[PDB]
Amino acid sequence: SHAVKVYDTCIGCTQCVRACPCDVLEMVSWDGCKAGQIASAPRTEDCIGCKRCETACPTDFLSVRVYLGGETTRSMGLAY
Amino acid sequence: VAGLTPCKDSKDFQRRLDGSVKKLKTRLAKYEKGTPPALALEKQIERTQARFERYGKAGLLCGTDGLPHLITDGRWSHSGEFVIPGLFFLYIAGWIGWVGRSYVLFARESDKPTEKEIILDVPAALSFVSTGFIWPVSAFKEFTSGNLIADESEITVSPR
Amino acid sequence: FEISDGVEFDLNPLVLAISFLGWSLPGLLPSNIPLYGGKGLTTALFAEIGEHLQTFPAPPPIGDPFWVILFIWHSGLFATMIFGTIGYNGYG
């Protein structure tokens, strides 16, 4: 599957979580940002690689990165 | 003379002139005298003859094909072929670039630089256009005063 | 007979017969134009069928009125068949 990673530049805006067509990103608690929340990628096996999370990211270069890796049915979005 | 013959005494050049004039005269033979077509073709013949005579007297060199060739090596006998025209270009181009850069800085120090760049302040633009006539000394003055070249630590660059 | 998974369809051949008659009886209207000869569309079709059955293995030649008569008659017949099925099954 694709490898989705989050970095400390995260500000907890949550737009990455709201932009994901699947449910791959969720907000968890953190102390490194004013919002007190950081993005996490627990369901990375459902990622398709659209990079909508990357698009909906306001930090200078992204706090969330999608590295496209091995392809599966779910990653390829094959309904057949 | 360099590797070719002067165009003023080239049978090929004379033959090309004769061919052009004969084509024009053949076209003219089918039009009544004094009609606009006849006058236009006669003027074309006159222009062709004047062009060939001027090229012959200019000192241009012509090859076996009968067409003038340019010696763009630096020879002063052929400066008018590339160097002096090139100097005129460089003058005009530096004028344009200098005035454009000046206007860019002027708009940079404005309330809305983008507005000044899409909707111009033509009084200031014409001011800079006028300034552009001594761009060589002005550009060198900028360079030596250090207002032209930016420091390496003040220009954004991608990571290695 | 089911026209679909569970939808029944009557498929009455009397509809076919009625549509055939409805198109053919008006087809009897004669015309003196060369294509029809002097007869109507249906009679001309019958005459051409007989004439080209007398010469069986040689198809009506291109330009023979047979092809035009066939096409016009069958266009009208199919139109009437569609309309008659519509009437029998929706307005029936």
């Binding site: 990673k5 989050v6 970095y7 449910d23 996490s40 990375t44 094959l78 309904a79 057949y80 | - | -």
Partner: protein, 137 residues
């Protein structure tokens, strides 16, 4: 848990529905309660009528299920949509509102997965992680 007896939104049928891969590998389901009988757009194509009460729908992709959920949440004001994944064994799983609350808002109990303790500029080089098991993080 998922109740397989919930009625469906009286769809008229389409060619965009699930295929043999749904019966062989995975088939997703979405259940939601509606206050009235509205008309919504199927993620596969066409219009359907949701019922007054509980509606269960079957799809081939989690993305289709979540697109339908987003349509319900935004177009309508239905936010009680639950998503499940069913295998041929019949092992229904629960996926979308995993922790009963949508991921867009933090909730106590979640553990960060895939978080890195530096910026992207601190990643190692492939030359440094070549012929080694190190990770570029």
């Amino acid at each position: 848990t998922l109740n397989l007896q919930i009625p469906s939104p009286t769809f008229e049928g389409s060619t965009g529905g699930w295929l043999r891969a749904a019966e062989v590998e995975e088939k997703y389901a979405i259940t939601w309660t509606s206050g009235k009988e509205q008309v919504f757009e199927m993620p596969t194509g066409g219009a359907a009528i949701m019922r007054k009460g509980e509606n269960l729908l079957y799809l081939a992709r989690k993305e289709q299920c979540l697109a339908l959920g987003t349509q319900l949440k935004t177009g309508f004001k239905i936010t009680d949509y639950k998503i499940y994944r069913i295998f041929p064994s019949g092992e229904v799983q629960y996926l979308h509102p995993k922790d009963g609350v949508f991921p867009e808002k933090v909730n106590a109990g979640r553990i960060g997965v895939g978080n890195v303790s530096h910026s992207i500029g601190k990643n190692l080089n492939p030359s440094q992680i070549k012929f080694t098991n190190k990770s570029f993080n």
